[PDB]
C-alpha cells in the first residue's frame, strides 16, 4: 500500500524544482518552431552560420542553467567556489539533457528555447559533429521514460549537485543537498508510474550515459576551437575551461 499524495516537505521541493525548470527551460509544448535551410542535406565540417546561432543559444541556456541552479534549495548557500565547480562540471550534462528533451522523433529534429528546430544534419553542422548520433541516440532512449518537467529538473539538479566532483571544498555538504533530490525523485517517479518501479533506477542510470556523453563533449570543444573562425563565447570558455 502507498499514499496517492506526497509528503508536504517533498511536495514543495518537487514544486520548487519543477518551477525552476519551467521558468528556465520552456517545454516543447509551448514553442513555435521555426526552421532554417543552412546545410539541410549534406554534412559538412562546420557551418559557420549555424555555429554562430548555436553558440549564442548555448550561451543563453548556460545563463538559464545558472538561474535554474540558484533556485535549487541550498545551492546559493554553498561557497561560490563550489558553485562554480559544480556548474562547470555539470554544464554539458544539463545542456545535453535539456536539448534531448525537445527531440521530436517523427521529424528527427530537436528544438531550442527560441523555437529553432534543426534536423540531425543541421545539428551536426552547427557544431555537434561526431557527437550527433550519440546525442540523438540518447534523446531516443529518453522517450520511453516519459519524463515531465519535475523529473527533468530533478535529474538536472541531481547531476549538478553531485558530491564526487573534483576540487570540491565541501563535498559532504554537497552530498547532503543531493539526498532530498534523490528522495524526491524516487517517490515522484514511482507514484506517477505505480506499475513499473524499475523506472527510477532506469532513470538514474542515464546520468551514467550522460556523463559518458559529456566527456566526449569536452573532447569536441578541443577540436571545435580549431575549426571556428574566432574564439569561443566568453561564458562557454568559462564553463568549459
Amino acid at each position: 500500500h502507498e499514499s496517492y499524495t506526497l509528503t508536504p516537505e517533498v511536495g514543495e521541493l518537487i514544486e520548487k524544482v519543477r518551477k525552476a525548470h519551467q521558468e528556465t527551460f520552456p517545454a516543447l509544448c509551448q514553442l513555435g518552431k521555426y526552421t532554417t535551410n543552412n546545410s539541410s542535406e549534406q554534412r559538412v565540417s562546420l557551418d559557420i552560420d549555424l555555429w554562430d546561432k548555436f553558440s549564442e543559444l548555448s550561451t543563453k541556456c548556460i545563463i538559464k542553467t545558472v538561474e535554474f541552479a540558484k533556485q535549487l534549495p541550498g545551492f546559493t548557500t554553498l561557497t561560490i567556489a563550489d558553485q562554480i565547480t559544480l556548474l562547470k562540471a555539470a554544464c554539458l550534462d544539463i545542456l545535453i539533457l535539456r536539448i534531448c528533451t525537445r527531440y521530436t522523433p517523427e521529424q528527427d529534429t530537436m528544438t531550442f528555447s527560441d523555437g529553432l528546430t534543426l534536423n540531425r544534419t543541421q545539428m551536426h553542422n552547427a557544431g555537434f559533429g561526431p557527437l550527433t548520433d550519440l546525442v540523438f541516440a540518447f534523446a531516443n532512449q529518453l522517450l520511453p521514460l516519459e519524463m515531465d518537467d519535475a523529473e527533468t529538473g530533478l535529474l538536472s539538479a541531481i547531476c549538478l549537485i553531485c558530491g564526487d566532483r573534483q576540487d570540491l571544498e565541501q563535498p559532504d555538504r554537497v552530498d547532503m543537498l543531493q539526498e532530498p533530490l534523490l528522495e524526491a525523485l524516487k517517490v515522484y517517479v514511482r507514484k506517477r508510474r505505480p506499475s513499473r518501479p524499475h523506472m527510477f533506477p532506469k532513470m538514474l542510470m542515464k546520468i551514467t550515459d550522460l556523463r559518458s556523453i559529456s566527456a566526449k563533449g569536452a573532447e569536441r570543444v578541443i577540436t571545435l576551437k580549431m575549426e571556428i573562425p574566432g574564439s569561443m563565447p566568453p561564458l562557454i570558455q568559462e564553463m568549459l575551461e
Binding site: V66, K70, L235, E238, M239
Partner: peptide, 11 residues
C-alpha cells in the same frame, strides 16, 4: 577569471 559566472552567482 570566471567574471561572467561570478556576475551570475552574486545576484
Amino acid at each position: 577569471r570566471h567574471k561572467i559566472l561570478h556576475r551570475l552567482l552574486q545576484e
